[PDB]
Ligand binder design. Structure first.
Ligand SMILES: [Ca+2]
Ligand SMILES: [Ca+2]
Ligand SMILES: [Ca+2]
Ligand SMILES: [Ca+2]
Ligand SMILES: [Cl-]
Lengths: 363, 363, 362, 362
């Protein structure tokens, strides 16, 4: 069972811009029936009140439903739509479209890019940031691995998740139902949803043993983390959507993925290590990049390499916005291109203050 | 001898503007040795990273030290400096200067304005938002009442407090010392400091019995509140400073204070009730206003009179900023003047979504 | 006979159509008779506010599918004016205008009437200039006819959506060798709003044409309309006009009245607008359908002699602050923060003030 | 013979003088030899940033008390340039310049030299206009003399603090019958920065006087200085100038070099500036005293053909975003986010770029 994955990084002019995707479909380069996932950077604030994420998904679902002659509801059941808000600094809004199809092809000369998709059930507000979310995410990650035809967790290089958050109305509704939520704070709820989801990845991949994970460890024990999880929260969904990206011997793709882990927000060495892991060994081979995907965050200590910063004290600009600008700038300075995927808030994703970074590259 | 309190509401051009106070001192209207407290609205963001509060205090302490021929340290030991940041909407930056004269003259008939000042000990970071802060504030409020020569809590109409907050550096240092702080969030720490301080007022005044107050109730049980507490947090101090304002039979002041409680952020009726309680019975009598002092906040329900608002969901503008703009605008529309004191974050200060409102008026 | 019905509907998010769908499914609203929807959407109300477009897309998709027509036809048939920015306590909502033909006598006197017109698309270099003024003026007169209002004194509110400049549009104009009115995205909203407002004043006879030139736009604050309400967005390239007034040829059980806020804290003008709409005492406040107002920071940096930081605050843009203030003032008078307040009142009321209208049940 | 010593000191808050006090109390700094302090302070770096003034007041009060002189005399003697905005990972700090007269001989080649000069106060209506250009140019020449630098090729960084407009100052100008360069407080910072930078270019011969006019300021991006670094603030009414370069008549154990970032992600220019200061490999990075750079949003709204939102974002002003980006780029090259990055680079390097200098131990 050979599958071919193709990946298209498409600049966008606004959250609702489908024109670049339409161009690739109209020219025959993309059969829209073979799209399995779209990962976006959308130009809202990336925090609670970011409606560019939902706007982008609605616009893509409308377009694809009408191209395929099916309902928007069926498109959303069939295709993962993960919109990561926040395009701070020089970060360029874009979408990354994953196309997958069965092919009649012989055995790869090694392992090549593979992608799998799985969705969880919807969560009650009082399940976010708790073991209910951890365990359901872990189940879905294992399902997505099977979908990708990856049996060895060491061949998984990036697990991208969209997960829910709490709004004031959802917290108050939980209160009226007699239920207490993990945190009575809309912005901080994103951290708990991101972190519980990341711990689900680590559980599913065997990066952390189950006996170490409990409600009390979530967003507290930073010794527990996944080296490939990348999680992103939004008002526009009530479940978790999972994209597993790795390499498989059952892949006929002309692409590979590699990764490293940024030890902190300015770790350009880790960017170069991720490039090398994807087969890019010199600046001359940089044109083989399809995209770079990374997590960024403010370290809980309030410092980087012992130097204070204000990210956790700044009441005007939220810390995930600042972290995204910084890490996108670092990556852009290495690869010469700010149109790369950077997502903020890296709870249990790499060490405290760091985050996984993956590169999808042409062979 | 006999206390006489005079109160001067002075517009400012910037946080460091001492010119209006200097004009009143140079004219002989204010003897600087008789200043006991200054309550400011300063034009920073009113949140964690607001340095206009400390800048204003430093500028006033420098100026008064040089006028009095004493050290800045002595001025700060002797005079309360309470700088409430955040001048959103049309709210006009200003300071309110409290002068206490000792006069060999009769008391005025009835009860007239009286002011008392007390400072607590410094608090360790791990004490903010907990019973150590509640109980020490209650002790100091009783001391300030004695300083004001008010022996009946019913004659206390406004208790204004400045209290500390947590920064990322202070939280990390607490962690290094093996201590758990009340909340691992700088902005939310302001709410816990404000709320514990307000409960200390309620305890001291007999508004709430001690047996109802515990660490678990702080910033949770909104049935517990003071009807006169007004608390404000800042990076620029490590203790609580307290100004008790009320009326005393042993006073020669030509001023009185009255108050009410806003039931919600748009309760103009409560503004008019506070004016009436201070002897202002018609629009023509509003020229007797010296200042209006009020607390404002976002209700935990995310609504006002059943109508949703975004204050608790908005990741760009923090909720205390929004609440200050709203309540200042409401008061300004009643009294015709936006140069009034409005402070945001009213945990245990009036009901959830409301806050105390006092008026100092000429007789 | 014309009969206008108006529904103020709370929304849970920019894309929330549930309240409108409830009214349609119950038979209160025939979707074919909707002529305009005026929204407050919870984005920042400035340049990078996509809640306006998200709301319009969601409503157009819902109505297109209910009516069995294309979204393109819906947007030609219905004015969608989405005013972003729900600061302070201001409650997100939509106001739906329904116009029916009824076989009943016109009501005594004058009753609510509405008209809609659209302009052509504008080139970036036309925004904030006489091209926009004159084309809006033509559309306003067209919308007056649509409303069957002959006397401009019977127009009480003219709501407009107009375009703005983004960095990409400015750069494209540069590449084409064309200078724009201002090389500033946020300020371009002011020029678009102001030129559109002067178009209203021109069409209504509030200001004679000889007084208006490119040089006076966003400069001569003596020139203003007392009924114009303009709002800018990235989501359109033309101007959309809703004229609201009263006509003798109307059978609506609603009326509209208005006043002008002299400044951002002018509660007296709120009460005057209520009275102009027939609400003369507090106990009649439940006859409000909605209140619609413009708010702005005064160029002097003061209100009633008192400084504020609106024009100096680099964190929060001045139209956000003005909306929070004026919504709070109105809410404190009427007891309800779910009213329409739009910021940036260039040539709309005096400098620092803005028109305020009340649609009320008779 | 002049010897310049430079101390980069982390700060805990805008008013933190403890690190400087420690260097004085240990005998490493004689406070009477301080000639300039260049700070990064943690306010927003825009109009309503009072951390800059708070930092200057705190340092002037500390130094006045240590020296037994008045604060007023300290401010007449020492340049205090506080650049607000510490976005991203940028670490608040101050850089203290100490100049000693020493009997030592002629150190081989050229070594670090510093000079200081102040302009007169400007009226608000003078900001962004030729009067500011010309007065700054005269002060830059005076500062070069103070530094004992006669050749403009030996000037590597000219750091300036300059004024801005607030609403109150604009109203003052209007009351006096004057118009200001722009009726926009945030944009006024760009005009003050840009006019000041053109004054540097004029003084250094980087542009000819006949090419500079009021109309060119903040419009002709072909006119720029490759060493000017300008920063605006509410806390002063004049321009303060620090010229940093190398002189044959210097005994400093430090040198300065520079390059120009072509855009906000130009790490090659960071490396070039390091190499120009004698740092030839990653293992010599420990010789850095500080890195000083200008950052800005390009007028095109793009970096290397890729769109960004810096000029469209109504929540976060573009100089805040540019500072975060360029500090992150420099930090990733040198391994330390405690470097000086200032935003808004009008006529400082190309459009979208800015000068970058390195002070390094020999
Ligand atoms: Ca992490
Ligand atoms: Ca309260
Ligand atoms: Ca106006
Ligand atoms: Ca430049
Ligand atoms: Cl109570």
């Amino acid at each position: 069972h050979m599958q071919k994955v193709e990946v298209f990084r498409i600049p966008t002019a606004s959250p609702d811009d489908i024109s670049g995707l339409a161009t690739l479909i109209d020219s025959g380069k993309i059969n829209p029936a073979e799209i399995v996932a779209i990962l976006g950077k959308t130009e809202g604030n990336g925090c609670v009140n970011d409606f560019t994420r939902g706007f982008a998904t609605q616009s893509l679902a409308m377009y694809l439903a009408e191209k395929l002659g099916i309902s928007r509801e069926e498109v959303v059941k069939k295709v993962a739509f993960i919109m990561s808000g926040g395009t701070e600094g020089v970060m360029t809004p874009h979408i990354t479209v994953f196309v997958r199809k069965d092919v009649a092809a012989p055995a790869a000369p090694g392992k090549r890019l593979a992608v799998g998709v799985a969705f969880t059930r919807d969560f009650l507000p009082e399940e976010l940031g708790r073991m209910e979310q951890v365990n359901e995410v872990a189940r879905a990650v294992k399902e997505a691995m099977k979908d990708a035809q990856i049996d060895d967790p060491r061949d998984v290089h990036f697990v991208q998740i969209k997960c829910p958050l709490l709004t004031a109305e959802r917290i108050e509704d939980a209160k009226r139902r007699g239920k207490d939520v993990v945190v009575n704070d809309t912005y901080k709820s994103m951290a708990y949803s991101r972190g519980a989801s990341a711990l689900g990845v680590a559980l599913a991949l065997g990066e952390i043993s189950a006996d170490k994970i409990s409600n009390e460890a979530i967003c507290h024990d930073w010794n527990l983390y996944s080296s490939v999880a990348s999680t992103s929260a939004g008002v526009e969904l009530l479940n978790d959507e999972i994209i597993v990206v790795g390499n498989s011997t059952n892949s006929a793709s002309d692409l590979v993925i590699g990764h490293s882990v940024m030890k902190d927000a300015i770790d350009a060495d880790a960017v170069r290590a991720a490039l090398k892991d994807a087969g890019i060994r010199s600046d001359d081979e940089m044109d083989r990049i399809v995209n770079v995907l990374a997590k960024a965050e403010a370290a809980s200590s309030g410092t980087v390499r012992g130097r204070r910063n204000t990210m956790l004290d700044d009441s005007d600009i939220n810390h995930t916005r600042s972290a995204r600008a910084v890490v996108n700038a670092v990556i852009a300075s290495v690869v010469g291109d700010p149109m790369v995927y950077v997502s903020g808030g890296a709870e249990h994703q790499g060490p405290d203050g760091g985050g996984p970074i993956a590169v999808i590259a042409r062979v």
